[PDB]
Amino acid sequence: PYSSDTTPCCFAYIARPLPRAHIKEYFYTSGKCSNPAVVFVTRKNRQVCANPEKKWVREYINSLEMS
């Protein structure tokens, strides 16, 4: 069983690092999705898909978990 409401998934990854200071939150997309992914929420409240295997992505996450 699972939510019958839509769930966000990512089908593309932002090619380069987003400005760290423009990011306030992050979350991993559901494991139900075909692609693993990190979604960064910017201070303008935009949601950007990123590759969790990328070094900058992991560092941003580590940083965010400290703030």
Ligand X SMILES: O=C(O)C1=C[C@H](O)[C@@H](OS(=O)(=O)O)[C@H](O[C@H]2[C@H](O)[C@@H](NS(=O)(=O)O)[C@@H](O)O[C@@H]2CO)O1
Other beta carbons within 10 angstroms of residue 60's beta carbon come to: 19
Q: Is 56 helix (H, G, I), strand (E, B) or coil?
A: helix
- 38 interacts with, out of ligand X, its own copies, none, CB within 5 to 8 A per kind: none
Nearest residue (CB) to its own copies, 27 versus 59: 27
The amino acid present at 8, given as its one-letter code, is P
Write out the binding residues for ligand X, residues 22-51 only, by CB under 6 A.
Answer: 28, 30-32
Residue 30 to residue 32: CA distance in whole angstroms: 5
User: Footprint of its own copies on this chain (CB under 8 A)?
Assistant: 1-15, 29-30, 32-34, 39, 46-50
Minimum CB separation of residue 36 from its own copies in Å reads 13
